[PDB]
Amino acid sequence: MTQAWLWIGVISMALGSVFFGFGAHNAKNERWQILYTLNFFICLIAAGLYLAMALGLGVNVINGRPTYWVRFVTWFCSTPLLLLDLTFLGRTSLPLTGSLLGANAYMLVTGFVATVTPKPMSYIWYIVSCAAYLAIVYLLAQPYRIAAERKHPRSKQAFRTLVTVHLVLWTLYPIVWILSPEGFSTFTQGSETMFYTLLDIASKVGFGFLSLNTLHTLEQATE
Amino acid sequence: MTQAWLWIGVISMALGSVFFGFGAHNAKNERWQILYTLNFFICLIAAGLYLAMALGLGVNVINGRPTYWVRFVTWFCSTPLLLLDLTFLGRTSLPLTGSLLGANAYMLVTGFVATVTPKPMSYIWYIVSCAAYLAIVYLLAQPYRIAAERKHPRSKQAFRTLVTVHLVLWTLYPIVWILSPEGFSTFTQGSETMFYTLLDIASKVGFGFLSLNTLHTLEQATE
Amino acid sequence: MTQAWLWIGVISMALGSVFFGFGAHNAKNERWQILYTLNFFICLIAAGLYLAMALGLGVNVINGRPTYWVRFVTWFCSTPLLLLDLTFLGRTSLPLTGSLLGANAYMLVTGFVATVTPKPMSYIWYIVSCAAYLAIVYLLAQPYRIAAERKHPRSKQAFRTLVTVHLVLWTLYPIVWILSPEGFSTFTQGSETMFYTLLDIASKVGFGFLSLNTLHTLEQATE
Ligand SMILES: *C/C=C(C)/C=C/C=C(C)/C=C/C1=C(C)CCCC1(C)C
Ligand SMILES: *C/C=C(C)/C=C/C=C(C)/C=C/C1=C(C)CCCC1(C)C
Ligand SMILES: *C/C=C(C)/C=C/C=C(C)/C=C/C1=C(C)CCCC1(C)C
Ligand SMILES: CCCCCCCCCCCCCC
Ligand SMILES: CCCCCCCCCCCCCC
Ligand SMILES: CCCCCCCCCCCCCC
Ligand SMILES: CCCCCCCCCCCCCC
Ligand SMILES: CCCCCCCCCCCCCC
Ligand SMILES: CCCCCCCCCCCCCC
Ligand SMILES: [Cl-]
Ligand SMILES: [Cl-]
Ligand SMILES: [Cl-]
Ligand SMILES: [Cl-]
Ligand SMILES: [Cl-]
Ligand SMILES: [Cl-]
């Protein structure tokens, strides 16, 4: 079950890599090339992640459980690129882009600490990591969206959809974590693997396609 | 004593985070937003550092002593942001900004090597790290200051003060290190903790306020 | 033999650092200052690498062999600066520069995995790392060169030479790796050390001088 879902991750991400890579090579202009290149590397990184986990790398027994700590290594590299999908389309300001990137990095590092420390101290870091996540939620839902809407007055719904899908998908990660054996142990590592793999596929391949469609919608509103 | 000073660090940095965070949310324009955001993340990172150390994380017995090696992890992230305070206010050129950032990173990595290696080889890395620090001192005191002064002809003293406080504070770190049990063992880990915590508070919260006042002085000289 | 070649590395890189550092301090304009600063840090990083290896740091017994894994730490920092030599001279676009940097980082991380895993699984990562290298080869030999040539119509041969020397030197690294005890064991660690040291000196000090001469050639074609 765990192995099966890791190999689904390998294949889904490698497929996503292939599509965005071809997309980058055939891109119309620099803006399409930028957005395809972003999503190509997001999926390539995740494909390497899933390859490593499937082959038994980046996993050690922590708190009595085999723990796939390597997810934080690759998430640290791929999730800023996802946030750059948003700020590239929104044409977000410099300080707001750095705030998104900074908050995200803080979230992952303190989430990594939560994952490798024993209970109950791990809950302290979980709370700190969630607080950094809540900052991201506020930044995307208010200043990022408002500015993006002012700059794309005809496409306001496009950005509302982008942020909605983003926060729906990302919010499920700490829910999976807290319900997993890291917290309340309401399901097994096998199901935990399934949930993170579903989320990763939706938030990288799925969201990657949404970002491309969002750019088409932005172009069509100024044709 | 060590625990007391670590908790003073937690509180001081978390307070500093709160002030700059509010400052960033209320900032007048993009320039104030940039500088508050820089100082917010400097203090937030240090608050995470002190939280981790206070809870017994990032410390292992090295050379027979409990050693808070995690300081190098977070210093690596927060001190480039401090240097960006200076180059943002000075409007420093691209190569000079990279030189400051590069020299700083080199200083911390070789300082980390000095801290985890045994004597006398540790002294070799201490000397290399100090050499990288001396490059920073020269870069700030001569090309950074001279260029900054040419661009702010009415505020030359503002930058002289910025650089003076910076180099006074940063020079005390290798002095603390060499006098600590890492070198001549003239004081205990408890006092060592006190000195690094005082320095960190002065060079992050204190210097952060100075940087904000420096920007006000720069604005007032062109009103 | 291993120690001798590590000390040759220390000296060659430290010499290279000194020349580019002086060059940066005396640079004519910002463009010369940028290119000297790039090459100064490339050589300074490699000098720290060779100092650490010569003193017995960054080497652990992996797969029954002492293995200088630290090379990947410093290569990760210095090789993007080499690629920036190329994109600075070519005035390469943003997505193409990120693609070069991204592919390079992927190459080194999966190459690091190949180096620390046992056979035959290490061959899987070797193949993945080479695939990332082949992407670099294609990106430099086609889109990077073509764009660079369109922007420097009078200096097309300069860029052809730059890319040729680059790919000749970089291709020798995976050949050394696969023929070393990491692969077919056709030569000893002593010779392996000699080859990586020769390559590092050619691809950093040597290529650094080529990059400077290339800039002179670019300037002379518009005098
Ligand atoms: C491609 C990978 C993605 C989008 C991963 C996203 C991960 C998160 C939003 C992580 C969230 C967490 C917290 C907010 C608290 C602590 C536990 C984490 C790391 C799962
Ligand atoms: C917020 C943290 C700050 C400003 C830390 C600054 C640290 C230094 C300037 C470190 C200096 C060192 C050397 C110059 C030599 C080796 C020992 C160090 C790392 C303490
Ligand atoms: C200054 C250091 C340089 C230019 C190092 C370059 C290293 C490489 C091009 C590494 C290549 C490798 C592969 C393509 C496959 C796996 C083995 C490596 C890491 C040697
Ligand atoms: C920058 C792209 C990296 C993607 C590949 C991630 C693979 C990491 C595997 C680490 C395993 C180390 C086990 C000892
Ligand atoms: C020229 C300087 C611009 C700075 C913009 C503010 C962005 C701050 C990013 C903080 C990220 C660090 C978190 C680890
Ligand atoms: C990017 C912001 C990071 C700030 C938090 C630093 C906490 C690091 C703790 C590491 C502890 C690991 C112990 C095993
Ligand atoms: C477009 C390229 C600009 C490069 C500017 C020079 C900055 C060099 C920074 C070196 C930092 C690396 C040290 C680890
Ligand atoms: C950013 C510049 C770094 C260059 C110096 C590299 C030295 C690394 C040595 C690491 C040794 C750790 C052994 C425990
Ligand atoms: C580890 C690999 C990540 C590097 C990917 C770089 C992508 C570059 C595309 C340009 C993005 C521009 C955003 C404003
Ligand atoms: Cl990932
Ligand atoms: Cl284990
Ligand atoms: Cl810090
Ligand atoms: Cl220990
Ligand atoms: Cl190197
Ligand atoms: Cl060992």
Side-chain angles (χ1 to χ4, degrees):
Chain A
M1 177 77 166
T2 290
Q3 290 299 297
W5 278 103
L6 292 176
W7 279 113
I8 282 159
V10 174
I11 297 167
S12 300
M13 295 305 180
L15 272 21
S17 297
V18 169
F19 167 80
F20 303 129
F22 267 92
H25 170 279
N26 304 324
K28 268 67 46 204
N29 49 37
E30 210 185 74
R31 286 209 97 218
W32 281 96
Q33 194 185 336
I34 287 171
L35 185 54
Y36 270 118
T37 297
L38 284 172
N39 292 127
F40 166 79
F41 275 105
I42 287 152
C43 289
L44 193 70
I45 286 153
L49 168 63
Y50 277 93
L51 189 61
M53 297 200 284
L55 297 171
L57 305 177
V59 51
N60 290 94
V61 171
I62 300 174
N63 296 323
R65 296 155 248 133
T67 307
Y68 286 95
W69 56 265
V70 67
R71 291 179 166 281
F72 288 97
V73 177
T74 62
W75 283 353
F76 193 88
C77 299
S78 56
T79 56
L81 299 185
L82 281 162
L83 291 171
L84 287 177
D85 275 0
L86 292 157
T87 65
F88 170 76
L89 295 160
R91 304 174 81 102
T92 309
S93 72
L94 171 56
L96 184 39
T97 300
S99 302
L100 284 168
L101 289 194
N104 179 67
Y106 207 89
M107 183 191 72
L108 290 168
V109 170
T110 59
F112 167 81
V113 182
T115 299
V116 302
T117 54
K119 288 165 227 186
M121 186 244 283
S122 63
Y123 295 131
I124 293 172
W125 296 99
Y126 177 79
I127 289 169
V128 169
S129 190
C130 287
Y133 178 59
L134 285 186
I136 293 176
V137 176
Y138 164 82
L139 286 173
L140 289 180
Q142 287 302 305
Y144 162 82
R145 188 192 39 87
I146 288 154
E149 278 172 2
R150 151 174 35 61
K151 285 191 188 191
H152 303 79
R154 291 180 84 98
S155 295
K156 289 162 52 187
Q157 179 59 39
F159 286 103
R160 279 158 188 157
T161 292
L162 251 200
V163 171
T164 292
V165 170
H166 186 279
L167 307 182
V168 167
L169 288 180
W170 283 34
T171 306
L172 286 162
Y173 283 88
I175 296 166
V176 167
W177 193 100
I178 204 61
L179 295 181
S180 86
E182 290 287 349
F184 290 89
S185 308
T186 78
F187 50 74
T188 55
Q189 173 91 251
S191 294
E192 179 196 296
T193 313
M194 170 175 67
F195 295 140
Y196 283 133
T197 305
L198 292 180
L199 291 164
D200 282 358
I201 300 174
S203 66
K204 297 188 165 63
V205 181
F207 189 86
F209 275 107
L210 175 52
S211 81
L212 297 169
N213 295 348
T214 294
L215 180 57
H216 186 83
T217 304
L218 298 184
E219 286 191 334
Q220 266 192 328
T222 325
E223 204 261 24
Chain B
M1 177 77 166
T2 290
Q3 290 299 297
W5 278 103
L6 292 176
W7 279 113
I8 282 159
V10 174
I11 297 167
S12 300
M13 295 305 180
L15 272 21
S17 297
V18 169
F19 167 80
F20 303 129
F22 267 92
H25 170 279
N26 304 324
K28 268 67 46 204
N29 49 37
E30 210 185 74
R31 286 209 97 218
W32 281 96
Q33 194 185 336
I34 287 171
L35 185 54
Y36 270 118
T37 297
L38 284 172
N39 292 127
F40 166 79
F41 275 105
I42 287 152
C43 289
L44 193 70
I45 286 153
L49 168 63
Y50 277 93
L51 189 61
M53 297 200 284
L55 297 171
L57 305 177
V59 51
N60 290 94
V61 171
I62 300 174
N63 296 323
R65 296 155 248 133
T67 307
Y68 286 95
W69 56 265
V70 67
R71 291 179 166 281
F72 288 97
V73 177
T74 62
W75 283 353
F76 193 88
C77 299
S78 56
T79 56
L81 299 185
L82 281 162
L83 291 171
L84 287 177
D85 275 0
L86 292 157
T87 65
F88 170 76
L89 295 160
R91 304 174 81 102
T92 309
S93 72
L94 171 56
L96 184 39
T97 300
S99 302
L100 284 168
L101 289 194
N104 179 67
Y106 207 89
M107 183 191 72
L108 290 168
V109 170
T110 59
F112 167 81
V113 182
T115 299
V116 302
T117 54
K119 288 165 227 186
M121 186 244 283
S122 63
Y123 295 131
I124 293 172
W125 296 99
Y126 177 79
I127 289 169
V128 169
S129 190
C130 287
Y133 178 59
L134 285 186
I136 293 176
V137 176
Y138 164 82
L139 286 173
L140 289 180
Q142 287 302 305
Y144 162 82
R145 188 192 39 87
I146 288 154
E149 278 172 2
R150 151 174 35 61
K151 285 191 188 191
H152 303 79
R154 291 180 84 98
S155 295
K156 289 162 52 187
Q157 179 59 39
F159 286 103
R160 279 158 188 157
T161 292
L162 251 200
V163 171
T164 292
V165 170
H166 186 279
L167 307 182
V168 167
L169 288 180
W170 283 34
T171 306
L172 286 162
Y173 283 88
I175 296 166
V176 167
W177 193 100
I178 204 61
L179 295 181
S180 86
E182 290 287 349
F184 290 89
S185 308
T186 78
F187 50 74
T188 55
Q189 173 91 251
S191 294
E192 179 196 296
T193 313
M194 170 175 67
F195 295 140
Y196 283 133
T197 305
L198 292 180
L199 291 164
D200 282 358
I201 300 174
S203 66
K204 297 188 165 63
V205 181
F207 189 86
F209 275 107
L210 175 52
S211 81
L212 297 169
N213 295 348
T214 294
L215 180 57
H216 186 83
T217 304
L218 298 184
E219 286 191 334
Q220 266 192 328
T222 325
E223 204 261 24
Chain C
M1 177 77 166
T2 290
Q3 290 299 297
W5 278 103
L6 292 176
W7 279 113
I8 282 159
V10 174
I11 297 167
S12 300
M13 295 305 180
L15 272 21
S17 297
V18 169
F19 167 80
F20 303 129
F22 267 92
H25 170 279
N26 304 324
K28 268 67 46 204
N29 49 37
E30 210 185 74
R31 286 209 97 218
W32 281 96
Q33 194 185 336
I34 287 171
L35 185 54
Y36 270 118
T37 297
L38 284 172
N39 292 127
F40 166 79
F41 275 105
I42 287 152
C43 289
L44 193 70
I45 286 153
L49 168 63
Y50 277 93
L51 189 61
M53 297 200 284
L55 297 171
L57 305 177
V59 51
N60 290 94
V61 171
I62 300 174
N63 296 323
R65 296 155 248 133
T67 307
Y68 286 95
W69 56 265
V70 67
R71 291 179 166 281
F72 288 97
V73 177
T74 62
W75 283 353
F76 193 88
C77 299
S78 56
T79 56
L81 299 185
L82 281 162
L83 291 171
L84 287 177
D85 275 0
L86 292 157
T87 65
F88 170 76
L89 295 160
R91 304 174 81 102
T92 309
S93 72
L94 171 56
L96 184 39
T97 300
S99 302
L100 284 168
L101 289 194
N104 179 67
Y106 207 89
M107 183 191 72
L108 290 168
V109 170
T110 59
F112 167 81
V113 182
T115 299
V116 302
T117 54
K119 288 165 227 186
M121 186 244 283
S122 63
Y123 295 131
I124 293 172
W125 296 99
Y126 177 79
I127 289 169
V128 169
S129 190
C130 287
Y133 178 59
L134 285 186
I136 293 176
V137 176
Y138 164 82
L139 286 173
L140 289 180
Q142 287 302 305
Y144 162 82
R145 188 192 39 87
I146 288 154
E149 278 172 2
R150 151 174 35 61
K151 285 191 188 191
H152 303 79
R154 291 180 84 98
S155 295
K156 289 162 52 187
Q157 179 59 39
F159 286 103
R160 279 158 188 157
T161 292
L162 251 200
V163 171
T164 292
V165 170
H166 186 279
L167 307 182
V168 167
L169 288 180
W170 283 34
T171 306
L172 286 162
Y173 283 88
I175 296 166
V176 167
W177 193 100
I178 204 61
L179 295 181
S180 86
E182 290 287 349
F184 290 89
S185 308
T186 78
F187 50 74
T188 55
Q189 173 91 251
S191 294
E192 179 196 296
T193 313
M194 170 175 67
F195 295 140
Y196 283 133
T197 305
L198 292 180
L199 291 164
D200 282 358
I201 300 174
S203 66
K204 297 188 165 63
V205 181
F207 189 86
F209 275 107
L210 175 52
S211 81
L212 297 169
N213 295 348
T214 294
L215 180 57
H216 186 83
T217 304
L218 298 184
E219 286 191 334
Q220 266 192 328
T222 325
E223 204 261 24

